[PDB]
């Protein structure tokens, strides 16, 4: 009795929806970041009694991250020089140094320079992963991506790199968050919080494994889609980093070619020829794979688990790919994953041979090509691997077979934004109460 309509504003209630997210980050360096002006500082509030649903496979911010990264790379490459005139027929025998089978470029070509009436027989070095033989006489060669796309040299000073980025919601939207220690990226979290901005997310580019990542709270977490037993990619998140080290011992000599633009070829290789390689702590890798197998055979309880190397595809998926400095690696991982398990600290080091190339097809798809300028001197690198991008083979009876994959770059960042979710605040609500309004 005597209950009347009343309305409230600023109510704590929300609904899920997709929206644009902000770009905010710390003070800009190098004159992955092109964003101005802001200085974020997040604060987290643990919400009592808040039970909320989550889903890593459906959240829109992964797609926004993907588009933002692609657009940022495009804007990075927008002012840089284009290597179109280099497409002319190369003449190549190239047996100068001790090892030419490794590189095989030592190639000459007629470039037009600075007058449009004079041509000069320059010559430079190239890895024959970047070079494809022309039909007929086997001494004629050509750049690999010229007949399919244009090639842009990366600007040497603009060194886009995994700089941390914070994604902030706009006013009227709140980024929810979950810190349940045993969350597989989907299902309800009864331990929820909110923040203005995400942590310093790094846009790392790698295949067969994701590095410089975060580490789980409990033991190793195995996140996967659960619509069907048939799955595209199974993400495994480590709780204990394993250190990977890599190096390129040779001393490379940069050279400039005038095609005020300039083209930065490899002038000469100094020092005796040694193929690039990387190191892994053998005992740590054994223990990590054993724990991964023990965790993984809970989902698949009555079958053996065997790890084997990938099959087919491009170099981006057949070998572990990544970047250190201004060079790109493609490291044979066959010796690592060749393991099997039954169904029932740094004493030794594994070494893996590895190859580098310059003409990088754009990682998502082919049609636009990047050319990496050579990094002079010798290179060393250290990084922390934190997760595995596995994918299983179906159609095999009484034996599972998980093998590395992950060519689709989106899985790298979907493995990180499982925490977050964006909701739209719905501040207005009604209720019954005692009332009067004088008339």
């Amino acid at each position, epitope marked *: 009795e005597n209950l009347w309509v009343t309305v409230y504003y600023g109510v704590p209630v929300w609904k899920e929806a997709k929206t644009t997210l902000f770009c905010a980050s710390d003070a800009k360096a190098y004159e992955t970041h092109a964003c101005v002006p802001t200085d974020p500082n997040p604060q987290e509030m643990v919400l009592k009694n808040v039970t909320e649903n989550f889903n890593m*496979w*459906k959240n829109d911010m992964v797609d926004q991250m993907h588009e933002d990264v692609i657009s940022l790379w495009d804007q990075s490459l927008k002012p840089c020089v284009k290597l179109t005139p280099l497409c002319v027929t190369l003449n190549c025998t190239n047996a100068t140094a001790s090892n030419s089978s490794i590189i095989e470029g030592m190639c000459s070509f007629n470039i037009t320079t600075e007058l449009r009436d004079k041509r000069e027989k320059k010559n430079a070095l190239f890895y024959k992963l970047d070079i494809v033989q022309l039909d007929g006489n086997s001494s004629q060669y050509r750049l690999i991506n010229c007949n*399919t796309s244009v090639i842009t040299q990366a600007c040497p000073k603009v060194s886009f790199d995994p700089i941390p980025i914070h994604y902030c919601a706009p006013a009227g939207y709140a980024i929810l968050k979950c810190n349940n220690k045993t969350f597989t990226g989907t299902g309800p979290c009864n331990n929820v919080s909110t923040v203005q901005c995400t942590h310093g997310i790094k846009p790392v580019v790698s295949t067969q494994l994701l590095l410089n990542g975060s580490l789980a709270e409990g033991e190793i977490i195995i996140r*996967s*889609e659960n*619509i*069907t*037993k*048939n*799955v*595209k*990619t199974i993400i495994v998140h480590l709780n204990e980093s394993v250190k990977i080290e890599c190096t390129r011992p040779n001393n490379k000599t940069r050279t400039s070619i005038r095609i005020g633009q300039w083209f930065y070829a490899t002038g000469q290789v100094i020092g005796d020829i040694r193929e690039a390689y990387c190191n892994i702590n053998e005992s740590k890798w054994n223990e990590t794979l054993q724990r991964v197998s023990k965790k993984l055979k809970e989902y698949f309880p009555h079958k053996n688990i065997t790890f084997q190397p*990938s*099959s*087919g*595809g*491009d170099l*981006e*998926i057949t070998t572990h790919s990544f970047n250190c400095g201004g060079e790109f690696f493609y490291c044979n991982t066959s010796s690592l994953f060749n393991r099997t398990y039954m169904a029932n600290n740094s004493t030794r080091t594994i070494t893996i041979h590895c190859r580098i190339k310059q003409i990088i097809n754009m990682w998502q*798809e*082919v049609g636009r090509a990047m050319y990496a300028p050579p990094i002079a001197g010798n290179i060393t690198c250290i990084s922390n691997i934190t997760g595995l991008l596995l*994918t299983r*083979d*179906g*159609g*095999k*009876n009484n034996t599972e077979t998980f093998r590395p*994959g992950g*060519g*689709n770059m989106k899985d790298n960042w979907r493995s990180e934004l499982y925490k977050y979710k964006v909701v739209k605040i719905e501040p207005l609500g009604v209720a019954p109460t005692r009332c009067k309004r004088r008339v």
Partner: antibody
Amino acid sequence: QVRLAQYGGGVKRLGATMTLSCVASGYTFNDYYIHWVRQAPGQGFELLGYIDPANGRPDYAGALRERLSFYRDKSMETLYMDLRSLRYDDTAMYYCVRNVGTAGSLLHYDHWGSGSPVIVSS
Amino acid sequence: EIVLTQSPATLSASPGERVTLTCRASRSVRNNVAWYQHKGGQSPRLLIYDASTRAAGVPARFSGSASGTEFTLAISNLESEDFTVYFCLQYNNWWTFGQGTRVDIKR
């Protein structure tokens, strides 16, 4: 709109290698996996394997892992398959078929190709 | 593993009748099942891409329902064109097909 044309077929001699093909058309090439199914006469359909078009990752059936081999060509939007050492019971007509792949799982076929009959006999 | 034992081999129905088909899975396949219409050698067509959800462009007379491990496709107004071969599919595992059921003219 989408059409999956096929080429190759006819008679292939016993013990010889063969190479079918496919050509995508009215859709984004990278977004849909391609599968190769076959039907021997007097048998139900069965799957051989599937090839991701973007990164080229294949995956074959258990009984035919040695013989099969899948590869593509992104620029022409073309796919292939090679079945080495044809046996007599390879007499079958082979479809290429698309599937609707979600963000984290694969699902049913939607659009089937025109198919390529293959007769193994010398 | 999964053996979709589609049955019966041949269904007989007069034109205009209602008719039903069955696709017995050997074990659990969740809701991951689809049905197709085979033709005179031409490309098969998608009818239902779950146990019940009809596909785009399909005539409304085609309908399906789940029964756990057993699945069903039902045609309400059996026209002359529908007298053809239908096979069932499952995509919960490695992917298997049924033997195909023919729908012929009753007499």
